[PDB]
Amino acid sequence: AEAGFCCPADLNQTDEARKIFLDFHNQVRRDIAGASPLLNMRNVLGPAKNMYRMDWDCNLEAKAKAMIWPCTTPLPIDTSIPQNLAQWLLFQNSQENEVLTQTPWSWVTASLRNLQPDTEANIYNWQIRPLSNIANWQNLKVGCAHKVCKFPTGTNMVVSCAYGGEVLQDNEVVWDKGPTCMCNAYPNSFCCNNLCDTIAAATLRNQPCK
Amino acid sequence: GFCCPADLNQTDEARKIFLDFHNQVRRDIAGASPLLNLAVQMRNVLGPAKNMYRMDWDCNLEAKAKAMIWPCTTPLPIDTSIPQNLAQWLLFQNSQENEVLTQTPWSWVTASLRNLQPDTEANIYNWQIRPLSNIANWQNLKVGCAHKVCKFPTGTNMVVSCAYGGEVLQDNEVVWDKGPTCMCNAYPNSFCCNNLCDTIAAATLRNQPC
Numbered sequence: 119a120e121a122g123f124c125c126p127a128d129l130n131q132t133d134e135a136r137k138i139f140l141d142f143h144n145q146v147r148r149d150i151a152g153a154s155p156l157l158n159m160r161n162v163l164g165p166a167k168n169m170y171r172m173d174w175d176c177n178l179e180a181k182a183k184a185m186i187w188p189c190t191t192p193l194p195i196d197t198s199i200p201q202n203l204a205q206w207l208l209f210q211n212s213q214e215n216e217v218l219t220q221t222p223w224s225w226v227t228a229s230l231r232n233l234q235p236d237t238e239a240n241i242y243n244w245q246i247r248p249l250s251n252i253a254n255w256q257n258l259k260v261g262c263a264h265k266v267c268k269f270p271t272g273t274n275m276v277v278s279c280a281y282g283g284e285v286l287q288d289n290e291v292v293w294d295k296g297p298t299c300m301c302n303a304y305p306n307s308f309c310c311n312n313l314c315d316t317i318a319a320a321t322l323r324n325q326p327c328k
Numbered sequence: 329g330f331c332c333p334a335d336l337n338q339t340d341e342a343r344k345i346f347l348d349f350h351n352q353v354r355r356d357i358a359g360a361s362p363l364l365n366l367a368v369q370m371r372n373v374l375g376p377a378k379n380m381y382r383m384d385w386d387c388n389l390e391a392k393a394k395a396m397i398w399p400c401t402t403p404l405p406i407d408t409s410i411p412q413n414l415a416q417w418l419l420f421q422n423s424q425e426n427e428v429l430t431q432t433p434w435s436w437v438t439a440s441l442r443n444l445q446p447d448t449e450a451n452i453y454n455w456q457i458r459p460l461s462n463i464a465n466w467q468n469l470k471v472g473c474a475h476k477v478c479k480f481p482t483g484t485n486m487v488v489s490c491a492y493g494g495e496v497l498q499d500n501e502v503v504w505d506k507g508p509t510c511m512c513n514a515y516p517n518s519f520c521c522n523n524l525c526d527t528i529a530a531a532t533l534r535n536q537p538c
């Protein structure tokens with residue numbers, strides 16, 4: 119049923135928030151795999167083969183929390199790992215989960231904006247780094263944190279996501295062009311809602327918290 | 329595609345309507361979601377069920393279904409020696425074919441639910457809930473359906489027949505197993521998608537070319 123994140127209490131974030139961030143990632147990955155519209159400029163990418171479902175990593179979440187928690191200008195961002203950072207203006211009437219739902223899409227918007235009609239979106243360049251982190255077919259783990267920071271420049275919502283694996287470099291293949299639901303990179307693969315997955319990953323994510 | 333013989337004289341579009349219907353009912357039961365778009369009434373919400381697996385088409389059952397309805401006689405040559413469902417709908421002058429085909433199988437659900445008492449165990453067979461029981465039978469995964477407009481002297485009807493694999497259900501037989509949605513362990517290499525169990529073998533098989 120509901121997702122087992124099983125993260126330590128001291129991370130001080132709700133599973134509902136974790137779910138928003140993780141569902142966001144898989145939604146982007148699924149849109150690319152199925153060549154479906156991303157935002158409600160170029161807005162359709164893919165299709166892609168071997169685009170697999172991401173799972174949470176509580177250690178990556180802790181890294182993300184550490185990068186934003188001091189609320190300093192600038193933040194102690196760890197550029198030695200793949201990560202995305204976003205900041206969102208808060209208004210009097212701002213509702214937290216709406217903010218958390220909307221904020222990450224800014225990474226998709228920023229990246230798409232830099233796509234020219236001729237740009238190979240599946241190939242990395244610095245102008246599309248945030249989307250590339252999200253759609254990296256080689257990375258299956260993510261952890262994100264959020265915080266209302268009172269910076270000297272004013273109060274904002276800050277979101278950081280840290281990713282498994284390596285920082286992408288120039289001209290790396292971010293994802294592989296191919297048919298939706300072609301899933302053969304891993305043993306015992308299946309496809310659900312246009313996103314590849316494996317029995318091993320499903321079995322692991324459904325283990326009870328301990 | 330469904331790869332069924334040309335002489336069955338039915339489109340894959342109709343086959344998908346019938347197949348999707350069956351798996352919609354099964355997924356509602358598996359996931360304890362409302363069956364009819366009607367969600368105050370608890371007799372409209374059955375389940376959850378464990379080991380409810382996705383159904384697949386069978387061209388030979390379709391042939392048996394077609395044979396039961398094609399002559400348009402009164403009575404029809406229904407073969408009660410196998411599990412089957414029959415639906416007849418008196419057409420109106422502006423009825424559209426595929427719209428009726430999408431609607432009429434639901435009468436099997438509505439008719440069975442109509443016979444549930446508040447304390448009735450809906451996973452336990454009795455003839456009053458036979459049509460729903462055929463659809464939701466966990467021990468059968470094959471279905472084949474046909475449709476035809478018959479000019480009976482008593483009026484022109486859309487007629488739909490679905491034939492099912494396996495045995496005719498008997499009084500007090502367990503139709504499906506009460507248990508957690510997405511617990512799928514009746515077969516090796518199982519997975520769950522949209523609240524419905526499936527296997528890698530069954531996915532591979534249905535995705536083969538004719």
Ligand SMILES: *[C@@H]1O[C@H](CO)[C@@H](O)[C@H](O)[C@H]1NC(C)=O
Binds near residue numbers: 130
């Ligand atoms: C956890 O987060 C809330 C803000 O959402 C904060 O007010 C609270 O003090 C935090 N708890 C700790 C121990 O940091």
